[PDB]
Design a protein around this motif. Structure first.
Motif, PDB file in Angstrom:
ATOM      1  N   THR A   1      11.791 -27.988  77.231  1.00 53.55           N
ATOM      2  CA  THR A   1      11.845 -26.614  76.755  1.00 53.55           C
ATOM      3  C   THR A   1      11.511 -25.678  77.908  1.00 53.55           C
ATOM      4  O   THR A   1      11.302 -26.103  79.044  1.00 53.55           O
ATOM      5  CB  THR A   1      10.884 -26.387  75.583  1.00 53.55           C
ATOM      6  N   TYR A   2      11.457 -24.385  77.604  1.00 55.20           N
ATOM      7  CA  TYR A   2      11.141 -23.397  78.625  1.00 55.20           C
ATOM      8  C   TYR A   2       9.640 -23.194  78.776  1.00 55.20           C
ATOM      9  O   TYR A   2       9.153 -22.986  79.891  1.00 55.20           O
ATOM     10  CB  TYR A   2      11.818 -22.066  78.297  1.00 55.20           C
ATOM     11  N   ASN A   3       8.901 -23.243  77.672  1.00 54.73           N
ATOM     12  CA  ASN A   3       7.451 -23.118  77.691  1.00 54.73           C
ATOM     13  C   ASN A   3       6.865 -24.193  76.795  1.00 54.73           C
ATOM     14  O   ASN A   3       7.137 -24.215  75.590  1.00 54.73           O
ATOM     15  CB  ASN A   3       6.998 -21.734  77.216  1.00 54.73           C
ATOM     16  N   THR A   4       6.070 -25.080  77.379  1.00 52.51           N
ATOM     17  CA  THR A   4       5.323 -26.040  76.585  1.00 52.51           C
ATOM     18  C   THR A   4       4.191 -25.310  75.871  1.00 52.51           C
ATOM     19  O   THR A   4       3.617 -24.360  76.412  1.00 52.51           O
ATOM     20  CB  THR A   4       4.786 -27.149  77.493  1.00 52.51           C
ATOM     21  N   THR A   5       3.908 -25.716  74.626  1.00 56.51           N
ATOM     22  CA  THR A   5       2.814 -25.110  73.869  1.00 56.51           C
ATOM     23  C   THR A   5       1.471 -25.360  74.543  1.00 56.51           C
ATOM     24  O   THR A   5       0.602 -24.474  74.572  1.00 56.51           O
ATOM     25  CB  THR A   5       2.804 -25.655  72.442  1.00 56.51           C
ATOM     26  N   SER A   6       1.304 -26.553  75.123  1.00 56.71           N
ATOM     27  CA  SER A   6       0.129 -26.838  75.939  1.00 56.71           C
ATOM     28  C   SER A   6       0.074 -25.935  77.162  1.00 56.71           C
ATOM     29  O   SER A   6      -1.005 -25.497  77.569  1.00 56.71           O
ATOM     30  CB  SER A   6       0.127 -28.306  76.361  1.00 56.71           C
ATOM     31  N   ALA A   7       1.235 -25.607  77.731  1.00 57.92           N
ATOM     32  CA  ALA A   7       1.273 -24.735  78.898  1.00 57.92           C
ATOM     33  C   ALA A   7       0.908 -23.300  78.541  1.00 57.92           C
ATOM     34  O   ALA A   7       0.243 -22.610  79.322  1.00 57.92           O
ATOM     35  CB  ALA A   7       2.655 -24.787  79.533  1.00 57.92           C
TER      36      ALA A   7
ATOM     37  N   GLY B   1      12.174 -30.251  84.722  1.00 60.13           N
ATOM     38  CA  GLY B   1      11.083 -29.395  85.114  1.00 60.13           C
ATOM     39  C   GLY B   1      11.499 -28.052  85.673  1.00 60.13           C
ATOM     40  O   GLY B   1      10.664 -27.143  85.754  1.00 60.13           O
ATOM     41  N   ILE B   2      12.766 -27.890  86.038  1.00 59.18           N
ATOM     42  CA  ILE B   2      13.258 -26.694  86.709  1.00 59.18           C
ATOM     43  C   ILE B   2      14.216 -25.975  85.776  1.00 59.18           C
ATOM     44  O   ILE B   2      15.177 -26.578  85.286  1.00 59.18           O
ATOM     45  CB  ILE B   2      13.961 -27.052  88.026  1.00 59.18           C
ATOM     46  N   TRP B   3      13.965 -24.691  85.531  1.00 56.71           N
ATOM     47  CA  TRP B   3      14.872 -23.852  84.768  1.00 56.71           C
ATOM     48  C   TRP B   3      15.417 -22.758  85.676  1.00 56.71           C
ATOM     49  O   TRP B   3      14.736 -22.293  86.594  1.00 56.71           O
ATOM     50  CB  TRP B   3      14.169 -23.259  83.552  1.00 56.71           C
ATOM     51  N   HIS B   4      16.660 -22.361  85.423  1.00 55.19           N
ATOM     52  CA  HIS B   4      17.392 -21.502  86.349  1.00 55.19           C
ATOM     53  C   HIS B   4      18.152 -20.451  85.556  1.00 55.19           C
ATOM     54  O   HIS B   4      19.105 -20.781  84.846  1.00 55.19           O
ATOM     55  CB  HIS B   4      18.347 -22.323  87.207  1.00 55.19           C
ATOM     56  N   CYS B   5      17.738 -19.196  85.681  1.00 55.50           N
ATOM     57  CA  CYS B   5      18.474 -18.108  85.060  1.00 55.50           C
ATOM     58  C   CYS B   5      19.772 -17.847  85.812  1.00 55.50           C
ATOM     59  O   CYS B   5      19.853 -18.012  87.031  1.00 55.50           O
ATOM     60  CB  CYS B   5      17.623 -16.842  85.015  1.00 55.50           C
ATOM     61  N   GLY B   6      20.798 -17.446  85.066  1.00 51.83           N
ATOM     62  CA  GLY B   6      22.114 -17.227  85.634  1.00 51.83           C
ATOM     63  C   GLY B   6      22.185 -16.000  86.516  1.00 51.83           C
ATOM     64  O   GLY B   6      22.431 -16.109  87.720  1.00 51.83           O
ATOM     65  N   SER B   7      21.980 -14.827  85.928  1.00 51.23           N
ATOM     66  CA  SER B   7      21.868 -13.614  86.719  1.00 51.23           C
ATOM     67  C   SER B   7      20.548 -13.613  87.479  1.00 51.23           C
ATOM     68  O   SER B   7      19.614 -14.336  87.141  1.00 51.23           O
ATOM     69  CB  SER B   7      21.943 -12.378  85.832  1.00 51.23           C
ATOM     70  N   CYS B   8      20.532 -12.863  88.583  1.00 50.34           N
ATOM     71  CA  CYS B   8      19.397 -12.520  89.450  1.00 50.34           C
ATOM     72  C   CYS B   8      18.692 -13.708  90.110  1.00 50.34           C
ATOM     73  O   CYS B   8      17.746 -13.493  90.876  1.00 50.34           O
ATOM     74  CB  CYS B   8      18.359 -11.658  88.708  1.00 50.34           C
ATOM     75  N   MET B   9      19.150 -14.938  89.836  1.00 53.11           N
ATOM     76  CA  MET B   9      18.866 -16.150  90.614  1.00 53.11           C
ATOM     77  C   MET B   9      17.376 -16.449  90.769  1.00 53.11           C
ATOM     78  O   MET B   9      16.948 -16.980  91.796  1.00 53.11           O
ATOM     79  CB  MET B   9      19.533 -16.072  91.986  1.00 53.11           C
ATOM     80  N   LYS B  10      16.567 -16.114  89.771  1.00 54.00           N
ATOM     81  CA  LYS B  10      15.118 -16.261  89.873  1.00 54.00           C
ATOM     82  C   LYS B  10      14.725 -17.571  89.203  1.00 54.00           C
ATOM     83  O   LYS B  10      14.510 -17.625  87.991  1.00 54.00           O
ATOM     84  CB  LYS B  10      14.404 -15.065  89.255  1.00 54.00           C
ATOM     85  N   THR B  11      14.615 -18.623  90.007  1.00 48.58           N
ATOM     86  CA  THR B  11      14.380 -19.964  89.494  1.00 48.58           C
ATOM     87  C   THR B  11      12.918 -20.118  89.091  1.00 48.58           C
ATOM     88  O   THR B  11      12.016 -19.721  89.834  1.00 48.58           O
ATOM     89  CB  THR B  11      14.753 -20.995  90.556  1.00 48.58           C
TER      90      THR B  11
END
Ligand SMILES: [Mg+2]
Ligand SMILES: [Mg+2]
Ligand SMILES: [Mg+2]
Ligand SMILES: [Mg+2]
Ligand SMILES: [Mg+2]
Ligand SMILES: [Mg+2]
Ligand SMILES: [Mg+2]
Ligand SMILES: [Mg+2]
Ligand SMILES: [Mg+2]
Ligand SMILES: [Mg+2]
Ligand SMILES: [Mg+2]
Ligand SMILES: [Mg+2]
Ligand SMILES: [Mg+2]
Ligand SMILES: [Mg+2]
Ligand SMILES: [Mg+2]
Ligand SMILES: [Mg+2]
Ligand SMILES: [Mg+2]
Ligand SMILES: [Mg+2]
Ligand SMILES: [Mg+2]
Ligand SMILES: [Mg+2]
Ligand SMILES: [Mg+2]
Ligand SMILES: [Mg+2]
Ligand SMILES: [Mg+2]
Ligand SMILES: [Mg+2]
Ligand SMILES: [Mg+2]
Ligand SMILES: [Mg+2]
Ligand SMILES: [Mg+2]
Ligand SMILES: [Mg+2]
Ligand SMILES: [Mg+2]
Ligand SMILES: [Mg+2]
Ligand SMILES: [Mg+2]
Ligand SMILES: [Mg+2]
Ligand SMILES: [Mg+2]
Ligand SMILES: [Mg+2]
Ligand SMILES: [Mg+2]
Ligand SMILES: [Mg+2]
Ligand SMILES: [Mg+2]
Ligand SMILES: [Mg+2]
Ligand SMILES: [Mg+2]
Ligand SMILES: [Mg+2]
Ligand SMILES: [Mg+2]
Ligand SMILES: [Mg+2]
Ligand SMILES: [Mg+2]
Ligand SMILES: [Mg+2]
Ligand SMILES: [Mg+2]
Ligand SMILES: [Mg+2]
Ligand SMILES: [Mg+2]
Ligand SMILES: [Mg+2]
Ligand SMILES: [Zn+2]
Lengths: 69, 120, 91, 50, 114
Positions: C69-75, C52-62
């Motif tokens: 996936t990153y975006n569910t089609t239902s979402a 449920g948690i995605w984490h970008c490497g640079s700029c630390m904006k979780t």
RNA sequence: CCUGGGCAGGGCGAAGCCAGAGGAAACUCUGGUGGAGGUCCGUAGCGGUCCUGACGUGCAAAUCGGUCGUCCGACCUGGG
RNA sequence: AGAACUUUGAAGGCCGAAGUGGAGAAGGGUUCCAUGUGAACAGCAGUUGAACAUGGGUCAGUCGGUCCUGAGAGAUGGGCGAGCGCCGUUCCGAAGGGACGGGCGAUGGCCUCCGUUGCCCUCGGCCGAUCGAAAGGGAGUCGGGUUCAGAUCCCCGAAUCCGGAGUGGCGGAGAUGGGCGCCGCGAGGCGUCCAGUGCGGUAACGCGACCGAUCCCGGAGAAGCCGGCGGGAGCCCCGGGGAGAGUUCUCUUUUCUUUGUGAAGGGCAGGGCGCCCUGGAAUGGGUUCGCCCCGAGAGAGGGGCCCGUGCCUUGGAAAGCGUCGCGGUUCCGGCGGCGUCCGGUGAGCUCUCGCUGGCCCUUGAAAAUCCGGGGGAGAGGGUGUAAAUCUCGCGCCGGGCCGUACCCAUAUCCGCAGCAGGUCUCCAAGGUGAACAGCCUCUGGCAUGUUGGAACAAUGUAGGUAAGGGAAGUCGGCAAGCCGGAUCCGUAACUUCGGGAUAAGGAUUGGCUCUAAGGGCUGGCAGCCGACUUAGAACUGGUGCGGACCAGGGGAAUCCGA
């Protein structure tokens, strides 16, 4: 222990009270002077025997001096 | 022990029958690749920082050393010599063609100056 | 050199647990192990954190994403409906 | 023991000078640093409880 | 070749029994005890991670020994922010306060025109 | 449940990455790198298949010798 | 008195660093040590012992408990219960006895100056008393020597932490400047006013200190497993010197042991940075073993910070060790001479530090304590006079209680016992070898495991063979035996395309000479230094070569269970 570099600072330490032991250790190339004042050991190492002799002359007379061997 | 180790250093007692582990167990493939490619990748640094290879062929031969192309230092140095000779030949031909074109354009501008002086 | 022709990432499981189950786990393991394009720093450093948690490497904006996936089609459909009901006749 | 992510949303107390920290269920698409609003007249966006 | 022995009665290789081995002046390999490593303080809640620079990284009971030079930096928000937070929060506070003044004077112009 | 401790060496070589070749494109082929796993041989550890071996008033009110199954885990284990 | 067993010399062996070694946790409780006896006990014996009798032995601010919470256990409020009592731990509770400060009063000391007591005002969520770890968190002691038994405790020597300061122990900061007018040749003096709760670097940040109350925020404490890689130490290896010892039938500049610097402070290597400045890339560039990084700023140049367990320096050679000699019946951590040195290398093993990555419907602990920051309520002398404060250098005083011996085991524990059983950990050498495999040696232990002597009958228990046949024995190839390691060829049916597979089936393997290839460091293409691997060739031995050890029989099928 601590290592005093200058001569004036070491002789000020010798003039300073609450110091009860001075040990002179002759070595094969230099000579070390030890002051056990209180919980620290202050060492003046010097390589000139003439300066060691004049420091022994200018050492304050109200203090014990032990030559190590 | 010293006599046996000296015989091993000369290369004796190290045949086929007196190997009881695999080749990857004796000398690892990863260690061989690390030694091989660290030598082949710092020889390029000693060339680039001193004199030999330029900025642009360094990255190409860097990727070509990262790929399994260049076996050892001798054929790496010979391929650098081949690329250096080919680059010298290409820039010599380019300098000759550029000198011909430059003398042609300079003569054309001077002839334009001649016709302008004849008109006025 | 292409080594596996059908299993892809699921060759770490080898011969067990069925061709159909391995085929259905293949796409979602690719989805959980793929680096996604970060919408904030513009980089491709979206590394998967816990589920449920995605984490970008640079700029630390979780960011709180989907489970695989990153975006569910239902979402995305929910977000479109929420902005539509937002600008629909001012609540 | 929970597959849903937890969110740690800090608030501000209008009665005493102290920042209070609460634990929301993380809605989909929220990101760290987003101003999560809460109340009756809060505008309808994802994350705003109303 | 000289097998060596524990000095306390802590026979288990736990985290507190994290040791090393040194050599005595009497020519004997002794088994000396090492204090665990102290990590430097980090920033405040949200910036890219990385320990704050200029702080003697010790244990917080060694922070009683440490004086008021090797614990903070002379900057404002010294031993708390890694100064990227400082140079961002100064500009952020300034710009948001100036934009609040702009919104307030625009609403004052709306009051004058309405 | 909390809190600690531990598991020699090898074999198979997934994803990803690099280089070369083919093709119009889709993409494919070759050689490396990589080290994945409720993965294989195997030690300590843990259990106990067979000899229905040894004992069978024994070392022992269940043990011993070979032969064993597994050994990065659904692993073994101390204390509370 | 008496020796197969006690002790010592010597010889031969075992354990062989995953121990038959050196130490601990639980448990035992005197078993530890010395002296004496041998009627009891030790399954024979003892002159022996863990037996007996007598007498000793355990020394702590810095080792641990003590402090903290963890899973949990628990009392009051409350509820229930005939009742001992039970439920519950924030619920249905008037569940804080503290404090910056101000005012008023009184007492006390050197009633100036301070220290106390009472009343009033103001401020102040506990996530609820309390217990719960001799492996979790938890500040700070290390080096040598000493006994028949102690050792980080005792002696010597060298350090550190935590509390204490009222008449506020000594220095150093805060602290000492600017302007104006007068005198004076100037140096300087006088009078007035004003400033001064530190500075420097563009920066990242640095120094000898750097006013800080209720309150708020943050960090540490405070993190899983598995890969890789790099630095450091210890051990191992090689070359040389120095000291002692071993062999010398012949050779051997030969063989074996040792060749040191603790905690603490300073300096310097080394490692790391997701830390800054200049600067702007594309013909894309820089780096890893793998990745990765770059306009949200790469390369390059210059900086800053952290760990510095490494080296040097005070400790520190006066102790320690090796070797030779000399004095005292003995007592003296005696007395003297010399040395305790230069290097190199690593897919080397262990520990540690650091970078990076993988794994997850597993996200991998809390609290006690301690620190920093934001706020500026308040405090301070007001000037040629010095404070309010100090997380700076010193100096002074104290650190109470409890445990500390020994075994930690094929003989100090449990199993009725000196029982092939069971019980949790750290340290780990040399050779062959991939290996902490198996085998043999070194340090260190041991007497073969509650008995010795003589002979080698049947039967037995473990081990090895056997001409020819090769499963004909047997319910059944039960047991035993074959292939077994490595390198190079070659690998089927079927299939979820991953496997089957080390499928199956072949060749080589010893010893000694060579040959070729795989690197580093120095220069405006040349020279020096070492690593162990692979491949090929020749020669030779009684076809012998994984020579011991280490160690897959294979194939075709059926049923069942993925
Ligand atoms: Mg590989
Ligand atoms: Mg502990
Ligand atoms: Mg397995
Ligand atoms: Mg198999
Ligand atoms: Mg086994
Ligand atoms: Mg059993
Ligand atoms: Mg058995
Ligand atoms: Mg039986
Ligand atoms: Mg019988
Ligand atoms: Mg087996
Ligand atoms: Mg297995
Ligand atoms: Mg022997
Ligand atoms: Mg042992
Ligand atoms: Mg006796
Ligand atoms: Mg007897
Ligand atoms: Mg005894
Ligand atoms: Mg007795
Ligand atoms: Mg003491
Ligand atoms: Mg303690
Ligand atoms: Mg109760
Ligand atoms: Mg009651
Ligand atoms: Mg307690
Ligand atoms: Mg003892
Ligand atoms: Mg000692
Ligand atoms: Mg103090
Ligand atoms: Mg390492
Ligand atoms: Mg090293
Ligand atoms: Mg040091
Ligand atoms: Mg003891
Ligand atoms: Mg026993
Ligand atoms: Mg019994
Ligand atoms: Mg046993
Ligand atoms: Mg070895
Ligand atoms: Mg070897
Ligand atoms: Mg080991
Ligand atoms: Mg026995
Ligand atoms: Mg027996
Ligand atoms: Mg006997
Ligand atoms: Mg026969
Ligand atoms: Mg025969
Ligand atoms: Mg046959
Ligand atoms: Mg037949
Ligand atoms: Mg039959
Ligand atoms: Mg059989
Ligand atoms: Mg046979
Ligand atoms: Mg098969
Ligand atoms: Mg098997
Ligand atoms: Mg089954
Ligand atoms: Zn991002």
């Amino acid at each position: 222990p601590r290592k005093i570099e200058e001569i004036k600072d070491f002789l000020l330490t010798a003039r300073r009270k609450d110091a009860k032991s001075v040990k002179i250790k002759k070595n094969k190339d230099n000579v070390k002077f030890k002051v056990r004042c209180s919980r620290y050991l202050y060492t003046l190492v010097i390589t000139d025997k003439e300066k060691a002799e004049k420091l022994k002359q200018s050492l304050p007379p109200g203090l014990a001096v032990k030559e190590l061997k | 022990c010293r006599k046996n180790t000296l015989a091993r250093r000369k290369g004796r007692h190290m045949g086929i029958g007196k190997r009881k582990g695999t080749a990857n167990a004796r000398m690892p493939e990863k260690v061989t690749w690390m030694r091989r490619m660290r030598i082949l990748r710092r020889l390029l640094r000693r060339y680039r920082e001193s004199k030999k290879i330029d900025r642009h062929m360094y990255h190409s031969l860097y990727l070509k050393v990262k790929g399994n192309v260049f076996k050892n230092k001798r054929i790496l140095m010979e391929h650098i010599h081949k690329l250096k000779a080919d680059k010298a030949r290409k820039k010599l031909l380019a300098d000759q063609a550029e000198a011909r074109r430059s003398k042609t354009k300079e003569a054309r501008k001077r002839r334009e100056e001649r016709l302008q002086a004849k008109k006025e | 050199a292409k080594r596996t022709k059908k299993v892809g990432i699921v060759g770490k499981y080898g011969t067990r647990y069925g061709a159909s189950l391995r085929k259905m786990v293949k796409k979602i393991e690719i989805s959980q192990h793929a680096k996604y394009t970060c919408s904030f720093c513009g980089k491709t450093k979206m590394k998967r954190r816990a589920v449920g948690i995605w984490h970008c490497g640079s700029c630390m904006k979780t960011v709180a994403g989907g489970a695989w996936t990153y975006n569910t089609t239902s979402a995305v459909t929910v977000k479109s409906a929420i902005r539509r009901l937002k600008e629909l006749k001012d609540q | 023991g929970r597959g849903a992510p937890l969110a740690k949303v800090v608030f501000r107390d209008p009665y005493r000078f102290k920042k209070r920290t609460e634990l929301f269920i993380a809605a989909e698409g929220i990101h760290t640093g987003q101003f999560v609003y809460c109340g009756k007249k809060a505008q309808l966006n994802i994350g705003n409880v109303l | 070749v000289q097998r060596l022995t524990y000095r306390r009665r802590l026979s288990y290789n736990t985290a507190s029994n994290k040791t090393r081995l040194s050599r005595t002046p009497g020519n004997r390999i002794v088994y000396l005890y090492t204090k665990k490593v102290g990590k430097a303080p980090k920033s405040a809640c949200g910036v890219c991670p990385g320990r704050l620079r200029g702080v003697r990284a010790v244990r917080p009971k060694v922070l009683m020994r440490l004086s008021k030079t090797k614990k903070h930096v002379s900057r404002a928000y010294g031993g708390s922010m890694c100064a990227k937070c400082v140079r961002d929060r100064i500009k952020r506070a300034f710009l948001i306060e100036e934009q609040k003044i702009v919104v307030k004077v625009l609403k004052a112009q709306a009051q004058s025109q309405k």
